[PDB]
């Protein structure tokens, strides 16, 4: 239908990469940059992500700050989805844990583009969604000596869509939990699991 | 025929690894000295065409066309110099080098946040005698995927 | 031969429910107790007849605990939702 | 004018669309994360929002040159206008205008018409002083420009909320030193 | 097409997990029958001269049994001493050979799931608690929860 406002996916996507060394720099707080007013020391983004899992600090307090930031995103976009477009499926108050399949059929296409899911739910008690090529970190690289050492590193990046889909259920009002695995498809991987 | 690919930054460093895509001459490091003398041939000839400039613009170097081979360069405006040594069968790769900048480089180097800008080792020997940086599982493989059609 | 008895039990168990044909399947197994009634001897090959009679006793216990909600014995409820007359009382 | 039309051609070349209001909430959310995490120190979030901007702009500028095959500018006067239209317009669908163009050609300012960091934003009276909202824009401009070998400093001086006046960034050129000692 | 339990025993005759699907949300206390069926098959490893194994190349689907409402068997790979067994409810049983090789191949799928979760070093020293919950969390979608995929 209506298609008025547009901004790039790219600068968006690097911002979605860049909430995590932001949070590491929050916890850890010379290139004298703003020398009209002040000075900075440095900010090693290549070593900030090589300080959480490549040095094994107390990131467990910091992981809540990755969890926290998606909630206020996840609370306040359901109303913004009907200002995104108005496709008449947009109403919210008919279903409880059975339009989370379909609110993550759209906002997961509107912050991640694709819709390859293969959803599975045990007796409509717990619903889980998984995809084979996650849009941030399947553009990401390695140090080529192994691969399993690199899957230590990427574990804080998975926690940003914790807060999103937990935000929408708390937008409907909930206290049901959520945990993230990392799958491995066999054809040319990460899974999600909510109660 | 393509002999060798190399990657040249602003700080006069090559970041090309073990020689292949027919840089081993068997798919039709010892050349760390060869990185310097390739740089001296280009940078001196960078200054020649800089000193002859017409019409309120600078001048990029397309190709030194030597005897018994060629060399094709692509100096960026960021000081990145993608250099490729052909065998004079095809003409200048001034869009193949744009494909390996806009697609295989910037989407696989400098978007990956576990690898830096490859600038310096937190130290002031960027201008020489530094061990290289580019070792990726994906990037080296997808480069070799792209250039095995050529050789 | 026990696998042949199992395939015969599946042939009877294609339709056997609520003593309409569950009684027929239990009756066919009680006449298919000729595994116990063909060979039964001492200094045999180590109580395979006793294992077969144990499985047949499980079948007869399932027959008595099926066919009319009466008693069980094991608190089993092995009969799910679906006439030799050896047990005429719950005690 | 070709560099007029480059932004519209790239806006038909690239196909990447987010709705603009979704970008604003993901910027208001992260500055709210800084606001509630740190101790309401609006001074002390401009610096680290700038640190965000620096360390994301110096990876931003090479994909900007990837889409826009442009030569390295050497004066102020052409990079000011191409930063005022193309390098924003392929990313942020805006065209900020250069005004107050100084006679010594070392400084300028930049009115921007609208911004998608500050579309529908209200700040509290605690936040109403001692804070500049788009210090990530200061970060991305300064960390963008120190890749291309000019150590300009920009600093954003007036919100459309702070003072409710106008949106300006004071800019100052500095030296144009290129790299050296290839002998080592 | 649906197992009635999943049982796992290592080489020391210690049961790793006697997993039963749907003991919450549905009928309880038949799990007390299920684990003692597993123990009947555990001391019924080899008894009264009945041999299950004759092929040493790949350990295929071995001898079917049937006891008091279920249909159990065994699949001893003989590789790292794994002794895992699966029963099926006899009440929904068609008794064909593509059924027989079908439960052979899904026995190899649950073998694959155990050998995948056996060497996941994303969490190390996962040997006593929530390794069990994690493998149950990988069990409970391969035979069920297909209801919403379409």
Of D108, D107, D87, which Cα lies nearest the Cα of D99?
D108
Burial classification of residue B95, based on how many CB atoms lie within 10 Å of its CB (0-12 exposed, 13-18 middle, 19 or more buried): exposed
C-alpha B65/C-alpha B87 separation (Å) is: 10
Contact assignment for E149 to A118 by CB distance below 8 Å = yes
CB E104 within 8 A of CB E81: no
CA angle, D87 then D92 then D95, to 5°: 70
How does C11-35 read in b/e, with b if 16+ C-beta sit within 10 Å?
ebbeebbebebbbebbebbeebbeb
Question: Are residues E144 and A119, on separate chains, in Cβ contact within 8 Å?
Answer: no
Distance in angstroms (rounded) separating the CA atoms of residues D79 and D62: 15
Q: Pairing relation of β-strands E83-85 and A190-194?
A: unpaired
Whether residue E27 lies within 8 A of chain A, CB to CB, comes out as: no
Q: What radius of gyration do chain E's Cα atoms show?
A: 16
- Please report, for residues A126, B12, B45, B88, D117, the alpha-carbon distance to residue B7 in angstroms, rounded to integers and kept in the order given: 51, 10, 18, 21, 37
Q: Which two tokens stand for residue C8?
A: 């015969």
Interatomic CA distance for residues E23 and A73, integer angstroms: 37
Solved how? cryo-EM
Q: How many Cβ atoms are within 10 Å of C79's Cβ, its own excluded?
A: 19
Nearest-angstrom CA–CA distance, E85 and E102: 15
Backbone angles phi, psi at E85, to 5 degrees: -135, 155
What are E72's two structure tokens?
A: 């159990």
Contact A129, A119 (CB under 8 A): yes
| Total domains in the fold of chain B | 1
CA dist., res. B100 & res. A167, Å (int):
40
Q: Shortest Cα distance from E104 to chain C (angstroms)?
A: 18
Torsions phi, psi for B75 (to 5 deg): -75, 130
* Alpha carbon distance, N-terminus to C-terminus of chain B: 5
Indicate the angle between helix axes D2-13 and D77-89, nearest 10 degrees.
20
| C-alpha span between E147 and D132 (Å, rounded) | 52
Q: Is C90 on the interface with E (CB under 8 A)?
A: no
CATH no. for residue B18?
A: 3.30.450.70
- Counting CB pairs under 8 A, whether chains B and C reach 3 or more, is no
Alpha-carbon C70 to chain mean position: 17
Strand order in the sheet with D168-172: D97-99, D107-111, D168-172, D153-158
**Which of A120, A148, A152 lies nearest to residue E146, judging by beta carbons?**
A120
What's phi and psi for D52, nearest 5 deg? -50, -50
- Give the whole-angstrom CA distance, residue D13 versus residue C75: 74
Residue A98 in tokens? 């059975």
Nearest to B147 by CA among B14, B28, B30, B42: B28
Tell which phi-psi region holds residue B37, choosing left (phi > 0), alpha (psi between -120 and 50) or beta: alpha
The answer to whether B79 contacts D71, with C-beta atoms less than 8 Å apart, is: no
DSSP secondary structure letter of residue E101: H
To the nearest 10 degrees (0 to 180), the angle between helices A63-75 and A160-172 is 40
Q: How many CA atoms lie within 13 A of B34 on its CB side?
A: 13
State how far the Cα of E33 lies from the Cα of E45, in Å rounded to an integer: 18
Distance between CA D65 and CA D72 in Å, rounded?
Answer: 10
Beta-sheet pairing, E75-76 with A178-181: unpaired
Distance (Å, whole) CA E119 – CA E122: 9
Contact by Cβ (8 Å): D157, D138? no
Q: With beta carbons less than 8 A apart as the criterion, state whether A188 and A180 touch.
A: no
Task: Output the CA–CA distances (angstroms, integers) from residue D60 to A15, B126, B133, D69, D91, in the order listed.
Answer: 11, 23, 20, 14, 10
CA-closest candidate to residue E21, choices E88, E90, E96: E88
Q: Is there a contact between A170 and A155 (Cβ–Cβ < 8 Å)?
A: no
> Which residues in chain D are contacts of A33 at CB distance < 8 A?
50, 54, 142, 153
C79 Cβ under 8 Å from any chain E Cβ: yes
Residue A175 CB burial class (10 angstroms; 0-12, 13-18, ≥19): exposed
Are B38 and B52 in contact, with CB atoms under 8 Å apart? no
**Least CA distance to B133: which residue of chain A?**
A143
Q: Rounded to whole angstroms, what are the CA distances from D71 to B55, B59, D78?
A: 14, 9, 11
Candidate from D17, D63, D142 with C-beta closest to A33: D142
CA distance E38 to E40: 5
Nearest to B136 among A45, A47, A144 (CB): A144
Helices A9-27 and A160-172 cross at an angle (nearest 10°) of 100
Query: Domains, chain E, ranges and CATH?
Result: 5-142 (3.30.450.70)
Distances (CA, A) of A185 to A5, A131, A191, A192, B43: 36, 9, 11, 14, 48
**Mode of pairing for the β-strands spanning E75-76 and E83-85:** antiparallel
Q: Within its chain, how far is the Cα of A82 from the centroid?
A: 22
What are the CB-based long-range contacts (under 8 Å, 24+) for C59-66?
A: C59/C26, C59/C29, C60/C26, C60/C29, C60/C30, C60/C86, C61/E68, C62/C26, C62/E68, C62/E69, C63/C22, C63/C23, C63/C26, C63/C29, C63/C30, C66/C19, C66/C22, C66/C26
Closest chain B residue to the Cα of A47, Cα to Cα: B114
Q: Domain locations in chain D?
A: 1-184
CB nearest to B98's CB, from D61, D69, D181: D69
Q: Which residues contact C91 (CB under 8 A, 6 or more apart)?
A: none
Measured CA distances, A43 to A32, D133, D145 (Å): 12, 20, 17
DSSP code for E67:
B
Determine A/C contact with 3+ CB pairs under 8 A as the test.
no
The CB-side HSE value for C22 (13 A sphere, CA atoms) comes to 17
For residue D156, the surrounding DSSP H or E stretch is strand D153-158
User: By three-state DSSP, how is residue E41 classified?
Assistant: helix
Full DSSP string of B57-101: ------EE--SSS-EEEEE-SSS-EEEEEE-SSS---TTHHHHHH
CB E37 within 8 A of CB E30: no
CB contact set of B141 (below 8 Å; sequence gap of 6+): none
Residue with tokens 């007796």: A123
Rg (CA), chain C: 14
Instruction: State whether residue D111 is helix, strand or coil.
Output: strand
Phi, psi of D157 (to 5 degrees): -110, -15
Which range marks the domain in which residue B14 is found?
1-150
CA–CA min distance D124, chain B (Å): 35
Q: Produce one character per residue of D55-84: b if its CB has 16 or more CB atoms within 10 Å, e if not.
A: bbbbbbbbbbbbbbebebbeebeebbebbb
What's CA B62's distance to the chain center, in Å?
A: 13
Q: Give, in degrees to the nearest 5, the angle at Cα E47 between E42 and E53.
A: 85
Contacts of residue E10, defined as CB under 8 A and 6 or more positions apart, other chains included, come to: E16, E81, E82, E83
Buried b (16+ CB within 10 A) or exposed e, E3-42: bbbbbbbeeeeeebbbbbbeeeeeeeebeebbeebbeebb
Instruction: Give me Rg for the CA atoms of chain D.
Output: 17
Q: Specify the pairing of strand D97-99 against strand B2-8.
A: unpaired
CA distance B41 to E117: 56
- Distance separating alpha carbons of residues B25 and B29, to the nearest angstrom: 14
Dist. CA B39–CA B45, nearest whole Å: 10
Q: How many CB pairs under 8 A join C and E?
A: 36
Residue with tokens 């080899």: E46
As a whole number of Å, the CA-based R_g of chain B is: 16
Angstrom distance (rounded) from CA C41 to CA C31? 20
Place of tokens 């960078």: B46
Terminal Cα-to-Cα distance of chain A (whole angstroms): 34
8 A C-beta contact, residue B18 and residue B4: no
3-state secondary structure (DSSP) of residue D146: coil
Helical H runs in chain E? 31-42, 97-118, 131-139
Contact E75, E8 (CB under 8 A): no
Contact of D134 with D123, CB cutoff 8 Å: no
C17 Cβ neighbours under 8 A, 6+ residues apart: C82
C-beta atoms of C6 and E64 within 8 A? yes
Q: What are phi and psi of E118, to 5 degrees?
A: -70, -35
φ and ψ of B2, to 5 deg: -120, 125
Q: Which H or E element spans position A13?
A: helix A9-27
Residue A74, burial from CB neighbour count under 10 angstroms (0-12, 13-18, 19+): buried
> Rounded distance, CA D136 to CA D92, Å?
14
The kind and range of the H/E element at A108 are: helix A107-110
Domain D1-184 has CATH 3.30.1380.20: yes
- Residue B36, classed as helix, strand or coil, is helix
Please name which of D159, D56, D66 lies closest in space to residue A12, comparing C-alpha atoms: D56
Collapse the DSSP code of A115 into the 3-class scheme (helix H, G, I; strand E, B; otherwise coil) and give the result. Answer: coil
In terms of phi and psi (left: phi > 0; alpha: psi -120 to 50; beta: otherwise), the region of A31 is beta
In three state form, how does the secondary structure of chain C look? CHHHHHHHHHHHCCCCCCCCCHHHHHHHHHHCHHHCCCCCCCCCCCCHHHHHHHHHHHHHHHHHHCCCCCCCCCCCCCCCCCCCCCCCCCC
Q: Which of B140, B10, B8 is nearest to B71 (CA)?
A: B8
For B102, which of D61, D67, D181 is closest by C-beta distance? D67
Q: Are strands D168-172 and D153-158 parallel, antiparallel or unpaired?
A: antiparallel
Task: Tell me how far apart the alpha carbons of residues C56 and D69 are, in angstroms, rounded to a whole number.
Answer: 86
**Contact E93/E47 with Cβ under 8 angstroms?**
no
Instruction: Please spell the DSSP secondary structure of A39-89, one letter per residue.
Output: ------HHHHHHHHTTTT---TTTHHHHHHHHHHHHHTTHHHHHTT---S-
């Amino acid at each position: 239908e209506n298609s008025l406002p547009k901004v790039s996916q790219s600068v968006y996507q690097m911002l979605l990469n860049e909430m995590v060394p932001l949070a590491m720099g929050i916890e850890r707080q010379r290139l004298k940059i703003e020398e009209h007013h002040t000075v900075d020391i440095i900010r090693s983004h290549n070593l900030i992500h090589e300080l959480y899992k490549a040095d094994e600090e107390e990131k467990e307090k910091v992981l809540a700050r990755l969890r926290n930031i998606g909630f206020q995103i996840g609370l306040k976009l359901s109303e913004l989805l009907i200002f995104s477009n108005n496709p008449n499926l947009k109403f919210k108050e008919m279903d409880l844990l059975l339009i989370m399949k379909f609110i993550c059929r759209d906002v997961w296409k509107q912050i991640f583009g694709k819709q390859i899911d293969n959803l599975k739910t045990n007796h409509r008690g717990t619903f889980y969604l998984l995809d084979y090529d996650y849009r941030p970190i399947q553009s990401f690289s390695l140090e080529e000596d192994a691969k399993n050492e690199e899957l230590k590193m990427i574990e804080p990046f998975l926690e940003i869509p914790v807060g999103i889909i937990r935000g929408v259920l708390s937008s409907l009002g909930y206290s049901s939990e959520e945990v993230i695995c990392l799958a491995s498809f066999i054809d040319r991987g990460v899974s999600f699991h909510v109660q | 025929g393509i002999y060798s690919f190399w990657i040249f930054d602003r700080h006069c460093n090559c970041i090309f690894d073990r020689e292949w895509t027919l840089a081993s001459n068997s798919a039709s490091k010892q050349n760390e000295e060869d990185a310097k003398l390739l740089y001296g041939m280009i940078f001196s000839l960078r200054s020649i065409t800089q000193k002859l400039s017409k019409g309120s613009v600078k001048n990029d170097i397309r190709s030194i066309s030597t005897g018994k081979y060629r060399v094709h360069t692509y100096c960026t405006a960021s000081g990145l110099w993608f250099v490729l040594l052909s065998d004079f069968k095809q003409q200048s790769y001034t869009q193949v080098l744009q494909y390996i900048y806009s697609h295989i480089y910037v989407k696989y180097v400098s978007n990956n946040l576990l690898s830096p800008y490859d600038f310096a080792e937190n130290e002031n020997e960027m201008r020489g005698q530094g061990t290289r940086k580019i070792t990726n599982r994906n990037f080296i493989s997808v480069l070799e995927s792209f250039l095995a059609p050529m050789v | 031969a026990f696998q042949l008895i199992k395939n015969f039990i599946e042939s009877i168990s294609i339709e056997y429910r609520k003593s309409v044909r569950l009684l027929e399947f239990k009756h066919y197994f009680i006449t298919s107790m000729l595994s116990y009634f063909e060979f039964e001897n001492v200094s045999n090959p180590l109580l395979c007849e006793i294992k077969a009679e144990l499985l047949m006793l499980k079948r007869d216990n399932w027959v008595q605990g099926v066919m009319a909600t009466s008693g069980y014995r094991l608190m089993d409820k092995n009969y799910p939702n679906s006439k030799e007359t050896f047990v005429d009382e719950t005690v | 004018r070709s560099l007029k039309a480059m932004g519209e051609e790239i806006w038909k070349n690239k196909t990447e669309k987010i709705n603009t209001e979704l970008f604003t909430l993901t910027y208001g959310s992260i500055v709210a994360q800084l606001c509630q995490d740190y101790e309401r120190d609006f001074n002390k979030v401009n610096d680290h929002l700038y640190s965000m901007g620096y360390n994301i702009g110096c990876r931003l500028i090479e994909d900007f040159l990837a889409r826009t095959a442009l030569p390295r500018c050497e004066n102020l006067v052409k990079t000011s206008e191409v930063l005022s239209k193309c390098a924003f317009k392929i990313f942020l669908n805006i065209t900020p205008n250069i005004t107050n163009w100084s006679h010594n050609k070392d400084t300028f300012s930049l009115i921007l018409d609208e911004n998608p960091l500050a579309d529908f934003v209200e700040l509290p009276m605690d936040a109403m002083k001692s804070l500049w909202y788009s210090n990530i824009l200061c970060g991305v401009l300064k960390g963008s420009l120190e890749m291309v070998q000019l150590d300009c400093d920009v600093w954003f001086v007036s919100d459309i909320l702070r003072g409710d006046s106008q949106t300006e960034i004071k800019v100052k050129l500095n030296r144009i030193l290129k790299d050296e000692i290839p002998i080592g | 097409l649906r197992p009635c339990f999943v049982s796992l025993i290592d080489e020391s005759d210690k049961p790793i997990l006697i997993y039963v699907p749907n003991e919450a949300e549905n009928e309880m206390n038949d799990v007390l029958k299920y684990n003692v069926l597993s123990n009947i098959s555990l001391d019924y490893f080899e008894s009264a001269l009945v041999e299950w194994h004759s092929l040493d190349s790949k350990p295929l689907l071995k001898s079917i049994f049937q006891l008091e409402g279920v249909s159990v068997f065994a699949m001893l790979i003989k590789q790292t001493g794994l002794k895992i067994v699966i029963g099926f409810e006899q009440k929904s049983l068609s008794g064909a050979d593509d059924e027989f090789e079908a439960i052979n191949q899904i026995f190899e799928t649950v073998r694959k799931i155990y050998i995948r979760v056996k060497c996941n070093p994303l969490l190390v020293s996962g040997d006593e608690k929530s390794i069990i919950k994690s493998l149950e969390r990988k069990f409970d979608e391969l035979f069920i929860s297909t209801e919403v995929e379409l």
